[PDB]
RNA sequence: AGCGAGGUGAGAGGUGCCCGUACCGCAAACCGACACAGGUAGGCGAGGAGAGAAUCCUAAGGUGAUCGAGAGAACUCUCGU
RNA sequence: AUGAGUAGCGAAAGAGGGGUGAGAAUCCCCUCCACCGAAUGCCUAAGGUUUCCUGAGGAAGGCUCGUCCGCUCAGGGUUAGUCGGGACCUAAGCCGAGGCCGAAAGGCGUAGGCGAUGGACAACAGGUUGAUAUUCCUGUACCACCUCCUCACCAUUUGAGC
RNA sequence: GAGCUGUAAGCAAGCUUUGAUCCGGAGAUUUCCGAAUGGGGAAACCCACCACUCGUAAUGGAGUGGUAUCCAUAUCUGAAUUCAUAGGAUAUGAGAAGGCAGACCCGGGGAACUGAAACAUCUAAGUACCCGGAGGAAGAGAAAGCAAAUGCGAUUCCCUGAGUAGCGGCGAGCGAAACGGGAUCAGCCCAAACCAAGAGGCUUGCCUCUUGGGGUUGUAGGACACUCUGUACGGAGUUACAAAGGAACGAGGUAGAUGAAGAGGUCUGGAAAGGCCCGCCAUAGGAGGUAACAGCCCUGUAGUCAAAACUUCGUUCUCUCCUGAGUGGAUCCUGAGUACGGCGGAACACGUGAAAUUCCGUCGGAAUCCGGGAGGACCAUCUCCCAAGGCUAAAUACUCCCUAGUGACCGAUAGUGAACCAGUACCGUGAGGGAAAGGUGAAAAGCACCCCGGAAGGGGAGUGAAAGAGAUCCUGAAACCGUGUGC
């Protein structure tokens, strides 16, 4: 995955796009991550125990991370992704500059 | 835990701790079975813990022979 | 069922009769149970007859 | 061999709670082992004399969960009477 | 024969392992494709009448049997005159 | 699909009152009646392999129904020195070192050993739970073995004893 | 280099940048059965002995290791029997056993159906099948040859020759080889005389028994006598030519890393990879995935790099071992119950025929360099060649498997029997036989809540682009089943 936990990434695609956001969870054995205030679907929920009210429960699902990008940290702008070493470990690195993450 | 038991000595001081962790492990398994019980990871913990403990003894025999 | 020295079997083959009518048979051996020493330890072997002409012991 | 790995695990049953009142107790057991292991485990672990044992041992129960349709894993239980002027356990 | 420097006997105290142990077993769990009118070794085996384990009725004990009710015709079957 | 809601629903006495339940000819209880009774009763093999007991359920199976079970789920339940069998014996038969034969494979077969349906072998009589019981509990016993011990006897080389 | 404690939703408990999970290499543990091997045994079970250890006042009990047979070697015994032998006892052996991939090959055994329009000879067919041995290949293999020219020079395999020659109840049918052209190339040891040494037997100076050297051949060679020569200067090697090892270097495999270019705009749309207008990269437009068809979204691709450790190959070095040229023509050696022959059989394309050749069985049985064998009966001449001893890679055959990738190959009655927990369920005493069964949605967002109902199942609501999508979940035909109605 080109992406991690805890970015401020951009959308794609999809109903949500134009739109950026931080990541809660990734999910690389189904290559999907959810996004803060993205594919906010409703659940429907019985009142069983550990809020035994149920109801409609409104939640962020996951989505493709193919249909997401991150940002350059500089222009705030649409970037894609390259490695690069400095003082031994390797480190995300955003074309349209040398800049990290 | 690996450099610390290969610190340690192969006979009496491994040994003597392989036993008091099957001592805990067996208590373990009683609570479990009685239900007093909360901590399950220390049970697979205790386990993988007396394999090391053992293993690194045998790779001591070896290396005498 | 050999010569222990050649090593003579009972081999297999044929048998054509007049019109030539074929059926399965063996020719087997002319082998004879004999007292005589393998290494040591006189054996009571068998042993066949064209191995036994010309001067083997017995 | 240690008698840790000798004993398996206790059986909390009504007729084993029924039994603790008449100071037997119950366990279950490694298939293998036998009458004087285990008394002697118990022995050396509680530090508890014993009046005798009765020892057990039970099939598998065949199961189903959807088409699956295994077996249950075999037991060896064991019940051992102590001996009054003994000591009782947790 | 051989072993044979400590034995014999009695008492007291003590030790005594593994497998099986449920349940059915002339049966709806076994063999017969079936909850099949069949077959399934062996032990016990009551009373009256009775020679008798026959037979009829009954004990101990066990069953009322896996579709019914309702008319009571031809015909079929099993029966009685 | 037709046949056709037809044949069949697999020997054999059931009836009623109560109850349960959403719902009862069909389940539970009671009362009567009826059948077996050298058997349809008690034990127990082989075999089956959880069908046992308890509590929930009634989609399927039950030749109908079903509140029910030899069905489904959960849980639980089978306690041995003396019972049966192994640590004892062998028959038939089988295996079979070496060996004898034999194109090979293999066959035969001694010593030896497996092998019960037989032989030998120490525990019974009362309770006990929902389910085990000459196995558990209570009493009273027996068999084999061992000596940290006590006693009696005998003898250490004709030296008792095994 | 951040999620992860699988399928599998899940609550619980917990771990992880002090770097987990995951991937790869080398190791450790590795219950019981099974060749199964302490003995037994109805498979995964039982019962022991010897040492050592735990434990018991003692037995009783537990743990660790060993304890099969056969074979080889060594030793101690070494009976009837005196030596002596058999036999027995003990110790060493990474011995060999058994398995397989249903394929390839080497051999021993070896059918019938069928075809011949019957049928026995013949074919089918030396197939199938069984058995024993193997190896990664096997087998064959350096001339007692092909042949018939101013000759070719190990085997193997391919194309031809050739459906020819030929064989054959001259029927049905079977069916070559050589030449030639090609792939691959490679040649070498031994016995023997002879010598040196040793041993016993005394065959009393003869003997074979051993070790070593020596020598390996056909217009003959070798031994033996002569000269020449060389002892590591050089040369060959663990693939034969003798066997056993070590290092270094290079390349590669077994995990990986990097890796260009657009959310370009706008129209639909539930959602853009699509349409229209525009740009860009390219040693990269191979593939797959992403809410629909993506070179520029993701993983990736091309290209370039990378390995601690284990492995494959190659090079070099160490290491090892190494002799070969001629002339002589006294004598000696050159593979013995074979070579052939008779009688029975078989294989050779070649069925006993005129039947060479090769092999098997029995019986007989030779020369041995002035020698011997073949040239399709056989004899003579001529030509070619030296049997009865052995080794030898490559070219060739096959693929259980692994990796990478292809298809004018299938697309759920097809294609593996098997796209799903299948050699399962099920059937059978047994060998053995042997199925069926794919699809929610992009995503569970999988139907809160209200009513009917005991439930099941419905009607609303809600989610969703869609619920006529609702758990046999894409479409959903026909047979069949029904409702209503125009005539």
């Known amino acids: 995955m080109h992406v991690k936990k805890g970015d401020k990434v951009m959308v794609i695609s999809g109903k949500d796009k134009g739109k950026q956001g931080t990541i809660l969870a990734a999910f690389p054995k189904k290559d999907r991550v959810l996004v803060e205030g993205v594919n906010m679907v409703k659940k429907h929920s019985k009142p069983t125990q550990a809020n035994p009210q149920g109801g409609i429960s409104n939640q962020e699902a996951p989505i493709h991370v193919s249909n997401v990008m991150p940002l350059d940290p500089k222009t705030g702008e649409v970037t894609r992704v390259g490695y690069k070493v400095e003082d031994g470990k390797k480190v995300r690195v955003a074309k349209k500059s040398g800049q990290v993450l | ?65 | 069922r050999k010569c222990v020295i050649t090593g003579k079997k009972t081999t297999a083959g044929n048998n054509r009769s007049h019109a030539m009518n074929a059926s399965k048979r063996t020719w087997g051996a002319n082998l004879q149970k004999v007292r005589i020493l393998v290494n040591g330890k006189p054996k009571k072997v068998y042993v066949s007859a064209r191995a036994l002409k010309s001067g083997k012991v017995e | 061999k240690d008698p840790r790995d000798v004993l398996k695990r206790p059986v909390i049953t009504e007729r084993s709670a029924d039994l603790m009142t008449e100071k037997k107790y119950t366990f279950e057991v490694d298939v293998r082992a036998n009458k004087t292991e285990v008394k002697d485990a118990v022995e050396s672990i509680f530090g508890v004399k014993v009046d005798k044992v009765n020892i057990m041992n039970y099939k598998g129960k065949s199961k189903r969960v959807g088409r699956y349709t295994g077996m249950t894993s075999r037991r060896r239980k064991a019940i051992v009477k102590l001996t009054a002027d003994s000591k009782e356990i947790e």
Do not use: C
Not at chain 2, 54 to 64: W, Y
């Open chain 2, 1 to 65: 835990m690996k450099a610390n038991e290969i610190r340690d000595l192969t006979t009496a001081e491994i040994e003597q701790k392989v036993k008091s962790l099957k001592e805990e492990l067996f208590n373990l398994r009683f609570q479990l079975a009685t239900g007093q019980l909360e901590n399950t990871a220390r049970i697979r913990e205790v386990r993988k813990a007396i394999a090391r403990m053992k293993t690194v003894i045998r790779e001591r025999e070896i290396a005498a022979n």
